[PDB]
Design an enzyme around this catalytic site. Structure first.
Site, PDB file in Angstrom:
ATOM      1  N   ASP A  84     -25.536 -43.301  71.967  1.00 43.84           N
ATOM      2  CA  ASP A  84     -25.315 -43.767  70.590  1.00 43.84           C
ATOM      3  C   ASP A  84     -25.296 -42.350  69.292  1.00 43.84           C
ATOM      4  OD1 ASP A  84     -24.596 -45.292  68.158  1.00 43.84           O
ATOM      5  OD2 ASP A  84     -26.472 -46.055  68.007  1.00 43.84           O
ATOM      6  N   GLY A 175     -28.597 -49.901  57.509  1.00 42.30           N
ATOM      7  CA  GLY A 175     -28.368 -48.934  56.453  1.00 42.30           C
ATOM      8  C   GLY A 175     -29.058 -47.464  56.794  1.00 42.30           C
ATOM      9  N   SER A 177     -29.361 -46.422  59.961  1.00 41.52           N
ATOM     10  CA  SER A 177     -28.459 -46.219  61.107  1.00 41.52           C
ATOM     11  C   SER A 177     -27.671 -44.838  60.995  1.00 41.52           C
ATOM     12  CB  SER A 177     -27.382 -47.246  61.572  1.00 41.52           C
ATOM     13  OG  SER A 177     -28.161 -48.447  62.200  1.00 41.52           O
TER      14      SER A 177
HETATM   15  C1  LIG Z   1     -27.234 -56.786  61.608  1.00 43.53           C
HETATM   16  C2  LIG Z   1     -27.249 -55.249  61.584  1.00 43.53           C
HETATM   17  C3  LIG Z   1     -26.062 -54.434  61.552  1.00 43.53           C
HETATM   18  C4  LIG Z   1     -26.172 -52.935  61.906  1.00 43.53           C
HETATM   19 BR1  LIG Z   1     -24.462 -52.302  61.533  1.00 43.53          BR
HETATM   20  C5  LIG Z   1     -27.115 -52.391  62.147  1.00 43.53           C
HETATM   21  O1  LIG Z   1     -27.208 -51.152  62.297  1.00 43.53           O
HETATM   22  C6  LIG Z   1     -28.643 -53.079  62.235  1.00 43.53           C
HETATM   23  C7  LIG Z   1     -29.613 -52.583  62.376  1.00 43.53           C
HETATM   24  N1  LIG Z   1     -30.772 -53.144  62.712  1.00 43.53           N
HETATM   25  C8  LIG Z   1     -31.586 -51.913  62.942  1.00 43.53           C
HETATM   26  C9  LIG Z   1     -32.998 -52.207  63.040  1.00 43.53           C
HETATM   27  C10 LIG Z   1     -33.784 -50.872  63.414  1.00 43.53           C
HETATM   28  C11 LIG Z   1     -35.304 -50.648  63.399  1.00 43.53           C
HETATM   29  N2  LIG Z   1     -35.656 -49.630  63.554  1.00 43.53           N
HETATM   30  N3  LIG Z   1     -35.812 -51.850  63.562  1.00 43.53           N
HETATM   31  C12 LIG Z   1     -32.952 -49.665  63.132  1.00 43.53           C
HETATM   32  C13 LIG Z   1     -31.589 -49.789  62.947  1.00 43.53           C
HETATM   33  C14 LIG Z   1     -30.901 -50.926  62.793  1.00 43.53           C
HETATM   34  N4  LIG Z   1     -29.874 -51.390  62.411  1.00 43.53           N
HETATM   35  C15 LIG Z   1     -28.648 -54.513  62.063  1.00 43.53           C
END
Ligand SMILES: Cc1cc(Br)c([O-])c(-c2nc3cc(C(N)=[NH2+])ccc3[nH]2)c1
Ligand SMILES: [Ca+2]
Length: 223
Positions: A84, A175, A177
């Site tokens: 990724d 957000g 990511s």
């Molecule tokens: C619904 C949805 C859509 C996208 Br696009 C995401 O990148 C994410 C996401 N969940 C995430 C959870 C985490 C974590 N560290 N727990 C990190 C990045 C994430 N990105 C969720």
């Protein structure tokens, strides 16, 4: 970022906001013309915003540059999120200084226990969406591979690592990511995924950047 704190304007000079009419992902500036982000943040029409702090107000120090190309890793798998990582070349070089600066790539991978700084404008709630206006920061340690694999059995590849808190309450979130995980001044991870946000026993999973350094260098070199 859930459970984090306000970083302070321009205290994270390599942080970039990927914007398509709204902030959708983070990224890291590695040189004046290139940014590293996550392949799952790919889309066309990306404007890179550097020197940002409050994403909804121009306050000074901001530089908005359009992306010339985005190179998603050829082996990126959207179902497992293996590989990724994505590189974005900017239409023109950014002006570097102390508010906008690049971060160095690692020479070695980091070990569990290493404390890192994760930042972003992602959700600050684990139950609901609350997106902030200013950049949030979180200090989190890299976890051992057994704790990571016991948390996500069968879903961790050698290109991923977990960082965070198993007790919950502090984590990166949607957000965030594409954004940076910096340890000892080197970019060691890219915010990739996790189950929910700041949930107990479900730490954040990050792209292990030390495994892509030769690829990043070769790709920037040939583009
Ligand atoms: C619904 C949805 C859509 C996208 Br696009 C995401 O990148 C994410 C996401 N969940 C995430 C959870 C985490 C974590 N560290 N727990 C990190 C990045 C994430 N990105 C969720
Ligand atoms: Ca601003």
């Amino acid at each position: 970022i859930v459970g984090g704190y306000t970083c302070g304007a321009n205290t994270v000079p390599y942080q970039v906001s990927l914007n398509s009419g709204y902030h959708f992902c983070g990224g890291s500036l590695i040189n004046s013309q290139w940014v590293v982000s996550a392949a799952h943040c790919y889309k066309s029409g990306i404007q890179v915003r550097l020197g940002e702090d409050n994403i909804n107000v121009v306050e000074g120090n901001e530089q908005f540059i359009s992306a010339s190309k985005s190179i998603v890793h050829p082996s990126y798998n959207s179902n497992t999120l293996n590989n990724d990582i994505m590189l974005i070349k900017l239409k023109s070089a950014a002006s570097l200084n102390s508010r906008v600066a690049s971060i160095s790539l690692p020479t070695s991978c980091a070990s569990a226990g290493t404390q890192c700084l994760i930042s972003g404008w992602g959700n600050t709630k684990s139950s609901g969406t609350s997106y902030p206006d200013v950049l949030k920061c979180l200090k989190a340690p890299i976890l051992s591979d057994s704790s990571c694999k016991s948390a996500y059995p069968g879903q961790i590849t050698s290109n991923m690592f977990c960082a965070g808190y198993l007790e919950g309450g502090k984590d990166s979130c949607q957000g965030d990511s594409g954004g940076p995980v910096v340890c000892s001044g080197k970019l060691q991870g890219i915010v990739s995924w996790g189950s929910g946000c700041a949930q107990k026993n479900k730490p954040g999973v990050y792209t292990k950047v030390c495994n892509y350094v030769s690829w990043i260098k070769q790709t920037i070199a040939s583009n």
